[PDB]
Amino acid sequence: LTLPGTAETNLAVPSNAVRKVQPYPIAKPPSYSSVDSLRPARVSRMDADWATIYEQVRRQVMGNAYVMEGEAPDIDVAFSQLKGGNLTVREFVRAVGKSASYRTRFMEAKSSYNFVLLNFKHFLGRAPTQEEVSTHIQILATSGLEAEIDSYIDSDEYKALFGDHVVPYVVYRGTYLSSERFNRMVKANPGGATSDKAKSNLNMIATVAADLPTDAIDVMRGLPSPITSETLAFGTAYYWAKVEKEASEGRSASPIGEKIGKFDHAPISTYTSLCSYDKVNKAPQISVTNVGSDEHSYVSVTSKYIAPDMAAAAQMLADCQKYKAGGNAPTGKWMKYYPGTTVNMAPYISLNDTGSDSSRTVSVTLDKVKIS
Amino acid sequence: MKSVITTVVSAADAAGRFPSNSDLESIQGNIQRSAARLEAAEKLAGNHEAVVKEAGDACFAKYAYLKNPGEAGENQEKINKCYRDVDHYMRLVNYCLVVGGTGPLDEWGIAGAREVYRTLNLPTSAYVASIAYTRDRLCVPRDMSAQAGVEFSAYLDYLINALS
Amino acid sequence: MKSVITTVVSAADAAGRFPSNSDLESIQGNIQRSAARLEAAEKLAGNHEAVVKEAGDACFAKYAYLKNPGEAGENQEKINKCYRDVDHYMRLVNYCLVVGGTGPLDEWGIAGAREVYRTLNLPTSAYVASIAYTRDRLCVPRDMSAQAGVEFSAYLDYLINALS
Amino acid sequence: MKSVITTVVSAADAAGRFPSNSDLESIQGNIQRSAARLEAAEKLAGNHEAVVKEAGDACFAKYAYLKNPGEAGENQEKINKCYRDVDHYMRLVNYCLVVGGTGPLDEWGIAGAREVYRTLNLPTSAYVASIAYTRDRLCVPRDMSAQAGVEFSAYLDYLINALS
Amino acid sequence: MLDAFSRVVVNSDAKAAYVGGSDLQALKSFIADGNKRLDAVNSIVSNASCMVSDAVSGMICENPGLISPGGNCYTNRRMAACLRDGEIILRYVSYALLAGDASVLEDRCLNGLKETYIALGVPTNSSIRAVSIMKAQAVAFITNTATERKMSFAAGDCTSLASEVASYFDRVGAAIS
Amino acid sequence: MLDAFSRVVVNSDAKAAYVGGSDLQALKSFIADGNKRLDAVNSIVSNASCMVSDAVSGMICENPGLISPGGNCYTNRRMAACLRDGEIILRYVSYALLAGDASVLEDRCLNGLKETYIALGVPTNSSIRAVSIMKAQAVAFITNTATERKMSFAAGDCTSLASEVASYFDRVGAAIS
Amino acid sequence: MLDAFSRVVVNSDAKAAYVGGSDLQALKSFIADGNKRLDAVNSIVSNASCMVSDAVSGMICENPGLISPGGNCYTNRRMAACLRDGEIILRYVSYALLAGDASVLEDRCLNGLKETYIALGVPTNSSIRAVSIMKAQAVAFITNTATERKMSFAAGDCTSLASEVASYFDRVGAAIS
Ligand SMILES: *C(=C)C1=C(C)[C@@H](Cc2[nH]c(/C=C3N=C(/C=C4\NC(=O)[C@H](C)[C@H]4[C@@H](*)C)C(C)=C\3CCC(=O)O)c(CCC(=O)O)c2C)NC1=O
Ligand SMILES: *[C@H](C)[C@H]1/C(=C/C2=NC(=C\c3[nH]c(C[C@H]4NC(=O)C(C=C)=C4C)c(C)c3CCC(=O)O)/C(CCC(=O)O)=C2C)NC(=O)[C@@H]1C
Ligand SMILES: *[C@H](C)[C@H]1/C(=C/C2=NC(=C\c3[nH]c(C[C@H]4NC(=O)C(C=C)=C4C)c(C)c3CCC(=O)O)/C(CCC(=O)O)=C2C)NC(=O)[C@@H]1C
Ligand SMILES: *[C@H](C)[C@H]1/C(=C/C2=NC(=C\c3[nH]c(C[C@H]4NC(=O)C(C=C)=C4C)c(C)c3CCC(=O)O)/C(CCC(=O)O)=C2C)NC(=O)[C@@H]1C
Ligand SMILES: *[C@H](C)[C@H]1/C(=C/C2=NC(=C\c3[nH]c(C[C@H]4NC(=O)C(C=C)=C4C)c(C)c3CCC(=O)O)/C(CCC(=O)O)=C2C)NC(=O)[C@@H]1C
Ligand SMILES: *[C@H](C)[C@H]1/C(=C/C2=NC(=C\c3[nH]c(C[C@H]4NC(=O)C(C=C)=C4C)c(C)c3CCC(=O)O)/C(CCC(=O)O)=C2C)NC(=O)[C@@H]1C
Ligand SMILES: *[C@H](C)[C@H]1/C(=C/C2=NC(=C\c3[nH]c(C[C@H]4NC(=O)C(C=C)=C4C)c(C)c3CCC(=O)O)/C(CCC(=O)O)=C2C)NC(=O)[C@@H]1C
Ligand SMILES: *[C@H](C)[C@H]1/C(=C/C2=NC(=C\c3[nH]c(C[C@H]4NC(=O)C(C=C)=C4C)c(C)c3CCC(=O)O)/C(CCC(=O)O)=C2C)NC(=O)[C@@H]1C
Ligand SMILES: *[C@H](C)[C@H]1/C(=C/C2=NC(=C\c3[nH]c(C[C@H]4NC(=O)C(C=C)=C4C)c(C)c3CCC(=O)O)/C(CCC(=O)O)=C2C)NC(=O)[C@@H]1C
Ligand SMILES: *[C@H](C)[C@H]1/C(=C/C2=NC(=C\c3[nH]c(C[C@H]4NC(=O)C(C=C)=C4C)c(C)c3CCC(=O)O)/C(CCC(=O)O)=C2C)NC(=O)[C@@H]1C
Ligand SMILES: *[C@H](C)[C@H]1/C(=C/C2=NC(=C\c3[nH]c(C[C@H]4NC(=O)C(C=C)=C4C)c(C)c3CCC(=O)O)/C(CCC(=O)O)=C2C)NC(=O)[C@@H]1C
Ligand SMILES: *[C@H](C)[C@H]1/C(=C/C2=NC(=C\c3[nH]c(C[C@H]4NC(=O)C(C=C)=C4C)c(C)c3CCC(=O)O)/C(CCC(=O)O)=C2C)NC(=O)[C@@H]1C
Ligand SMILES: *[C@H](C)[C@H]1/C(=C/C2=NC(=C\c3[nH]c(C[C@H]4NC(=O)C(C=C)=C4C)c(C)c3CCC(=O)O)/C(CCC(=O)O)=C2C)NC(=O)[C@@H]1C
Ligand SMILES: C=CC1=C(C)[C@@H](Cc2[nH]c(/C=C3N=C(/C=C4\NC(=O)[C@H](C)[C@H]4CC)C(C)=C\3CCC(=O)O)c(CCC(=O)O)c2C)NC1=O
């Protein structure tokens, strides 16, 4: 809408008011990158026509959206200026991302954490780290949608990889800033016939990019690698590991079990009296409200709640270092074993009949709200 | 536009390399096929007024309902608009027989046809009724050579497959 | 790999469309050229042991300095590596006469040559002395036909232009 | 974390290269400066019980208003929380004297200060009253050396400049 | 974007005329030197790496003010750009000799080429000299008058292609001037 | 990410203790071999292109199943990656010798290298042999016991750093195994 | 970006003035014809697809120089553009009917509409004629004097909004001329 020549909008850096448009598209990154020779060639503004620039912007920025002809007129607004040269293809995907057709299939329907991971998949063509999420999740908290898409397009990572004339694509650069950052990019970017719309939870890179260890599974990276770079290893060897994974990646089998949350349970023969291993760690999940006379009351047996292994980490490591001075004055004993133990009567309250008392011995130590 | 020449020099441009021996091999295909398609161009150019008079009314022979008032054919002059509306397609098939690719057909005749035929309420089935009447009337001894009628049919159904 | 057929089915896939009349047209070019290049391929396969012996020694006739100690060819076995290091290229020229494009020569012999041969200190001027020794020894009466000698030469200087 | 060592390593890693002569020359500075700040670290370690007691109440003498009921200091335990809430700052100043940069100050004490201290309504002016009371009481004969004194003060005002 | 076949249809689109036998015989003569044009593009890209290095060192050895410091081809980065910048000019004329008309390189390479070289500080008077050598080297190959490399062909005339590529190499000479 | 100076602060951050005069003298001895550590990083990156080219050809010359077709170092594309793939291991061990602890290569290069090589089809047991040659060459340089190249130093002990670099080359050994 | 309720607050921001009783009755008059405004823009978007198709074909049927080859609306792509291009003019004027002031289309559609049409080659004088038919059809709907289609409404005056649509449709014609 703005001008027939516009390199940069919104005046974020000071040196874009004097910056020309790029007269030619930018070069490839200068490292070796053995994978990209098997890859198809990148599509730019000045080598290809508008039939395939629109398809690859749908194949990368829109994921695989299946935009119809009456669907997305906001993209048809933004595409009609790109064919007139009124904005570059760098600014065009800023107009695609800020549009509501990108919002009404990736922002409202996916989750809050998954919206950041799809933005690195579409705009930068990779998958972020945890520190890249934690700087991008605050823009969704304090500044909203429009400033968060400005963090990709006005970044220096975009302008060095694509510039103003190159459609976004999966850039294999060989020497990466992290060894995770290759194979988390590859896992985030599968090949053809995959979209983002069915996986309303993505749930697998949402927990590999969540904690900084637990790099993702090898068959989830041998799957979208290119060809004469996967073969003689995907006939039937890892192929059943790929199919088993695809029925788990599809329908979003939540990886509490095998990926993170890793608890050595006891064998089933060890208890056998608290039996029926479907039910073994189930508790009543009770909830009361007690407001007026329209407030419902809880109860819906809970699931097999696991020891969380970090609340047992803050507890028993940060504290309970009451590991100090345990000689406890060994009085030439005969405490007939276990020492100062009160009989501890504890009368169960005499509601006049059918209520009775039992006792039990225990070692007693005075508490820490007891000194004073 | 989208021809066999500009397919193999846009793909060489996108890879950023010289015209290799693969790209020189497709242009050898043009020496064997221009002797099939260029006499299909001048057979079309020497008979173009006949094949729009003989075959533009075949849609009206099929669909006489649109000459009712209140429809896409109201008066005589919109039917005189219609033979101008269909010889452009026969000029574009003549433009694609001489190119060899399908280049002049897309951005001149197809790209945007779903927007102008819906909004101005033209039925696209009566378009391809006139195009498919031209398609099944090909024959070997009268019309053209035996190989030209393969390729002249092969551009007409591309207009059918894109409009439908 | 990068043949004449995988250019036109990838560029049709990049636009997201069917094989049009330009894409079927390029494969008709393969009918006129496979008569020429495949009889250059079987001439190469039945004579590959001779064209790496009395054309692999010619780089050592030009560069006798690299048989010195401290150089790229030290002992007998690295020279025995070296004729295997040449015969893989003539296997790839035999793999690109049979394909039709420069597909199997690119990612199997060319892509990665500037990083291996620089790091292993292997002089690429003594590669292209052996490749261009084969190139100028073509002739019409003895070796092949008059047209296969155009095309077998046309893949060798592509290997020269990639290494230099 | 953000030290002199992980500055010249991460910048060499982002350029994708070996540690050059410029990165080795930065570590030669660390021999010349660890004689100064590691005797600034033990003077903070052997005196941290004193410099949070007579520099934690100096905010309260400056700001006696916040011990009123309804304010950020209500009872004795929040004042007992408050001396813990400054003891972590003197631990992180001690953690930056031993590292050599502003590594442990930023993501442990600074990154997050504009969100906690606004929402929990803790006035940061009474934070920097307690830090700048410590800063202007340095001297060269009593406390430390003359060279530890400029750089013990050079970490305190960075805590002031990031809080204000 | 536009080959020799589609050049005559946009002349015919302005008149809305059917292409007929009054100018199809002019286009069938383009197919008559079909293998002649095809061998000519093969003769250019055969010795293409030796074409650009002999031309850009021929530009250096007549004007050594670039190798002097402050010159535009002084450092090792700028010579590697100038070896690359002259190769793109060779890479796009080989398209236009294949496509039959100078419209493939006209909007791709030559559009935006004048103001780029004057904003960057490229001496345009020596860029005319650099492409004048490749003008003199392309006509030596496709007329087979090259002194150090002779290629085998079927015998005949190829002067009509030699004037075509010489018309392309002054089109780049016009846009940089 | 973590150096040897900032390693002792996270051992003290878990106890919330001030670093005092009971463990600074172990860190002042890190300053005492400050130039000893510094010349050791210089001795590795001095001959680093001859380091990795002798190491990966040493892995080839004992196991010639990779140059056989179907091998992972067969073609010219994969060997250019494998010449690069062993150089990044040298590029990150020399970071951790400079930084003082195996923290820089641990989360950057090693977190995710095992299943990368599994998913790509890299023979992992031949990557053990590829980095075991670089272990034996790095201890030969910083003890100055290389037979083909001797570098000049001030005389003294460097055998504490010889165990230090060897403790990094099995960390790349264990994290790939 | 600015509605009729917030048009009066940037007037009073320039005086740093609290809004008072001298002009809120001018703003309560805007709420008094609130439902009168609300049915009018509903009458615009009711027969909106028949509005643009009659207007651009009326622009064609008085000036058949664009359907001639070399015209700006000759081919099938440009007619689908010209059907779309005038629909953006209807889509942004109808925003200004709901906003009450010509502000949302002044910066979004019209800010930079002139020099795009002269860089592309649009005949601006026929673009005056094309938007003028949409001016006369918009007053025909909201004053209900459309001959072919009559819609039912509550009785009263709508001539105030009939001057409002003509104040928008010449703002388009001013910024394209
Ligand atoms: C170890 C030296 C040691 C402890 C740890 C601590 C454990 C302990 N706690 C109690 C008594 C109570 N704990 C309660 C639980 C809570 N109080 C709260 O206000 C929050 C909401 C909640 C979680 C912290 C309660 C309500 C009591 C009883 C009242 C009270 O405050 O004491 C005991 C006493 C058990 C007994 O007397 O049999 C113990 C041992 N004390 C330690 O000594
Ligand atoms: C406080 C009540 C909790 C607690 C909170 C923490 N959350 C941390 C990170 C985090 N939390 C969420 C969920 C939340 N953020 C969102 O953006 C959305 C919706 C879109 C929701 C529901 C996410 C997604 C993340 C990751 C992003 C990020 O880390 O910034 C967190 C940080 C952990 C750390 O790195 O140390 C904390 C402390 N933790 C608690 O103990 C109490 C119970
Ligand atoms: C904690 C205060 C105790 C203690 C507890 C441990 N329990 C361990 C395993 C375990 N506990 C139960 C019983 C619990 N689970 C149930 O489902 C139900 C009710 C139906 C109850 C009461 C079971 C059945 C199991 C085994 C199953 C499993 O572990 O998943 C346990 C682990 C032992 C180990 O793995 O080594 C511990 C430590 N032990 C203590 O010291 C205090 C007294
Ligand atoms: C015992 C733990 C307490 C205590 C309990 C009393 N509650 C009395 C009345 C009452 N309690 C509730 C809340 C409760 N009833 C519900 O239906 C629900 C939600 C489902 C809840 C949480 C209600 C609604 C009422 C009725 C009156 C009111 O609205 O407050 C009560 C008086 C009845 C009686 O004498 O038995 C008692 C004694 N009070 C105590 O002193 C201990 C600490
Ligand atoms: C408190 C009012 C007294 C007093 C008490 C102290 N007792 C100490 C240790 C201690 N006390 C007992 C006896 C108690 N423990 C039992 O298990 C039983 C019965 C089964 C009884 C009556 C024992 C056995 C011990 C030694 C074991 C231990 O150290 O806990 C004690 C600690 C002394 C020390 O830490 O050195 C104190 C202070 N002392 C007093 O002054 C008043 C009069
Ligand atoms: C003595 C120190 C007390 C006292 C004791 C009396 N309690 C009498 C009756 C009574 N006591 C209880 C509570 C008791 N019985 C139980 O079964 C349980 C535990 C489950 C307890 C704690 C009950 C329930 C009753 C009966 C209540 C009734 O029926 O009214 C009692 C009356 C004589 C007798 O029944 O033994 C006495 C004297 N009363 C005192 O005044 C001092 C403080
Ligand atoms: C080939 C399919 C058949 C065949 C069919 C007949 N066509 C007859 C007449 C005819 N055809 C046209 C249009 C014609 N002119 C063209 O230039 C082209 C294609 C580019 C076509 C199809 C017209 C106007 C007419 C009627 C008068 C005329 O010849 O101009 C025909 C005569 C009877 C009739 O249909 O009117 C036949 C039998 N002819 C054949 O021999 C093979 C079997
Ligand atoms: C054609 C350029 C000349 C010609 C040259 C001669 N070549 C002679 C021997 C010779 N040539 C080759 C290479 C040849 N064999 C192949 O399989 C291929 C390509 C795949 C080629 C180019 C070899 C290996 C040898 C050695 C012995 C043999 O096999 O013939 C030759 C004899 C003298 C000499 O050895 O140099 C000549 C004169 N021959 C001609 O007639 C035209 C003029
Ligand atoms: C240097 C600026 C002056 C000087 C000032 C005086 N300070 C006095 C007492 C005092 N000083 C400090 C802080 C000091 N101790 C530390 O551990 C550190 C940092 C690690 C510092 C800066 C404290 C906490 C106290 C209170 C009592 C004490 O422990 O000494 C002092 C005596 C009078 C007074 O109490 O203010 C003076 C005059 N002393 C000098 O000689 C130069 C001039
Ligand atoms: C002009 C620059 C040349 C020259 C050209 C002539 N070529 C003639 C025939 C001819 N050329 C080819 C080459 C082309 N075909 C391929 O298969 C490939 C590679 C895949 C290429 C590059 C072929 C097959 C033929 C044979 C065609 C035939 O003769 O039937 C030729 C003879 C006349 C003609 O056919 O046009 C000429 C004059 N010859 C020259 O002297 C200059 C240097
Ligand atoms: C162990 C790998 C070596 C070895 C090391 C020793 N170096 C000693 C002193 C020393 N080292 C440097 C190198 C460092 N300084 C620089 O300027 C640069 C490049 C910019 C580097 C990489 C210097 C200046 C010095 C002199 C310090 C001094 O003596 O005052 C040294 C002597 C003890 C010590 O100073 O630490 C040793 C033992 N020597 C060896 O024999 C092995 C092979
Ligand atoms: C002027 C351009 C029109 C016209 C307008 C009048 N409308 C009058 C009342 C009125 N209008 C609406 C429409 C609006 N409300 C909705 O709920 C919706 C759709 C969701 C729309 C589009 C309503 C509800 C009412 C009733 C309000 C009432 O009378 O209480 C009206 C009478 C005066 C007035 O109330 O403003 C007029 C004059 N009438 C015309 O003749 C032209 C075409
Ligand atoms: C039709 C009544 C006109 C006319 C229209 C044409 N517009 C053409 C391209 C074009 N138009 C616009 C403006 C429009 N698009 C927008 O995005 C917005 C505001 C957000 C508006 C008002 C733009 C930006 C472009 C360039 C983008 C593109 O070309 O798709 C056009 C195509 C020209 C051609 O290529 O032949 C036409 C025909 N032109 C007319 O003659 C009448 C008056
Ligand atoms: C030569 C070809 C030719 C045309 C295509 C039409 C197009 C056309 N219509 C109108 C004028 C108009 N056009 C409409 C439009 C419509 N009325 C409806 O009921 C529908 C919703 C919609 C058509 C689908 C209206 C309402 C007017 C105002 C006059 C009227 O009510 O008829 C005008 C004059 C504009 C003006 O008043 O200044 C023109 C040129 N007229 C022509 O002369």
Side-chain angles (χ1 to χ4, degrees), chain G residues 47 50 54 57-58 61 129 133 136-137 140-141 145-149:
Chain G
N47 45 351
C50 201
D54 187 52
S57 315
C61 81
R129 175 74 265 188
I133 304 173
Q137 296 180 354
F141 294 153
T145 77
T147 67
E148 316 97 309
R149 166 161 162 87

Side-chain angles (χ1 to χ4, degrees), chain A residues 124-297 299-302:
Chain A
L124 293 174
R126 57 175 188 93
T129 60
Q130 183 43 61
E131 292 13 10
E132 269 161 332
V133 162
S134 238
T135 59
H136 276 87
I137 210 72
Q138 305 172 29
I139 319 177
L140 299 189
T142 76
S143 314
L145 176 76
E146 6 343 316
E148 196 273 343
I149 315 166
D150 277 0
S151 58
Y152 304 106
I153 311 298
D154 306 283
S155 87
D156 43 20
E157 194 169 344
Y158 199 97
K159 302 166 69 174
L161 279 178
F162 315 106
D164 310 345
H165 291 334
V166 180
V167 178
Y169 68 104
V170 182
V171 183
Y172 296 96
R173 68 215 62 170
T175 309
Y176 293 86
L177 288 89
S178 181
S179 88
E180 181 75 312
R181 210 180 283 200
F182 163 70
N183 47 61
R184 206 183 278 174
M185 168 199 299
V186 157
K187 179 217 163 314
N189 281 303
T194 232
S195 88
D196 298 306
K197 190 255 289 184
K199 305 157 253 287
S200 142
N201 39 9
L202 185 52
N203 268 0
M204 210 44 84
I205 215 162
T207 187
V208 175
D211 56 331
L212 244 111
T214 73
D215 45 354
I217 265 116
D218 46 62
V219 77
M220 271 192 351
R221 275 84 167 277
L223 161 65
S225 282
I227 288 91
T228 126
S229 177
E230 52 84 22
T231 191
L232 244 219
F234 273 91
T236 175
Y238 291 84
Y239 166 69
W240 307 108
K242 189 194 91 194
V243 171
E244 223 353 83
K245 185 59 75 180
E246 269 183 348
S248 167
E249 179 202 299
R251 98 211 172 187
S252 82
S254 66
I256 310 297
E258 67 281 283
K259 183 66 179 174
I260 137 104
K262 287 258 281 193
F263 198 76
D264 16 306
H265 286 271
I268 9 166
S269 71
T270 64
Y271 43 100
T272 327
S273 317
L274 287 356
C275 83
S276 240
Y277 69 100
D278 21 83
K279 22 281 317 165
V280 53
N281 298 145
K282 318 285 219 152
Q285 182 47 249
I286 325 173
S287 304
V288 294
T289 64
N290 204 359
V291 181
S293 165
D294 257 23
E295 26 48 289
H296 70 312
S297 154
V299 102
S300 252
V301 130
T302 195

Side-chain angles (χ1 to χ4, degrees), chain C residues 25-137:
Chain C
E25 208 262 347
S26 317
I27 324 288
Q28 191 41 248
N30 284 309
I31 311 300
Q32 264 69 35
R33 302 313 277 161
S34 298
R37 57 192 160 92
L38 291 179
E39 60 100 9
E42 55 202 18
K43 198 54 185 45
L44 198 63
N47 214 28
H48 66 274
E49 297 262 20
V51 303
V52 304
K53 175 58 69 186
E54 53 98 16
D57 303 331
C59 70
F60 294 117
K62 188 174 185 304
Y63 302 97
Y65 83 108
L66 59 94
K67 273 199 289 296
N68 290 154
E71 281 290 327
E74 308 260 11
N75 43 4
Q76 190 44 252
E77 59 99 8
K78 292 164 94 75
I79 312 296
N80 278 93
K81 286 296 281 299
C82 175
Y83 296 137
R84 184 214 51 100
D85 207 41
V86 162
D87 190 58
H88 286 188
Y89 275 132
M90 294 306 164
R91 199 162 43 90
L92 287 182
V93 176
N94 193 25
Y95 287 162
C96 299
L97 288 178
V98 67
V99 160
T102 78
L105 191 53
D106 279 346
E107 82 274 347
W108 283 347
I110 286 168
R114 286 98 175 269
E115 288 86 359
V116 174
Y117 302 145
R118 181 175 33 84
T119 322
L120 264 70
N121 275 128
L122 304 182
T124 79
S125 45
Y127 285 143
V128 302
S130 61
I131 304 301
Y133 185 74
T134 69
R135 189 197 48 176
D136 43 19
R137 291 184 83 236

Side-chain angles (χ1 to χ4, degrees), chain G residues 38-122:
Chain G
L38 215 68
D39 310 347
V41 60
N42 184 38
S43 162
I44 292 298
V45 296
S46 81
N47 45 351
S49 159
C50 201
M51 210 196 299
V52 295
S53 44
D54 187 52
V56 75
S57 315
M59 187 272 287
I60 287 303
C61 81
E62 62 92 21
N63 183 30
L66 314 162
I67 313 294
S68 158
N72 212 213
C73 287
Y74 162 67
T75 180
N76 209 3
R77 165 180 46 91
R78 301 182 140 148
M79 190 53 65
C82 196
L83 264 61
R84 195 259 324 277
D85 286 356
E87 185 283 338
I88 308 300
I89 314 300
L90 192 51
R91 193 267 306 278
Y92 271 105
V93 165
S94 44
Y95 287 170
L97 270 297
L98 205 168
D101 52 334
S103 77
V104 71
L105 81 165
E106 191 51 75
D107 72 315
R108 205 87 62 93
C109 165
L110 278 298
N111 188 85
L113 193 40
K114 195 209 78 191
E115 84 288 329
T116 61
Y117 272 13
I118 80 181
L120 173 63
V122 183

